[PDB]
Amino acid sequence: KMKAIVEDFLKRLHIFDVARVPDDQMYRLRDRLRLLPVEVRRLDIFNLI
């Protein structure tokens, strides 16, 4: 269940009261991320694995 990744993400960007922000927006957040490319670096490695 991805409610996982989003959490960490925002956190690593201090300022935000993670716990103090709903599950909503979060999902919509995924919805947008899913449509994004990967940085060659990142990507190029997964293909390898």
Partner: protein, 49 residues
């Protein structure tokens, strides 16, 4: 050796659903509580706060 007793489930037979309001209300009520007793409780919610 198996043997059971027929449940006998002939329908309505009596049409109370067209005059005996007083009693329907008492039925509905009943059938209703019955229902709540079953409707599974929910889980994993979003922290109220």
């Amino acid at each position: 050796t198996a043997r059971y007793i027929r449940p006998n489930l002939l329908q309505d037979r009596l049409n109370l659903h067209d005059n005996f309001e007083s009693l329907w209300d008492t039925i509905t009520t009943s059938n209703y509580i019955l229902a709540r007793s079953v409707v599974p409780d929910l889980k994993e919610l979003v922290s109220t706060e």
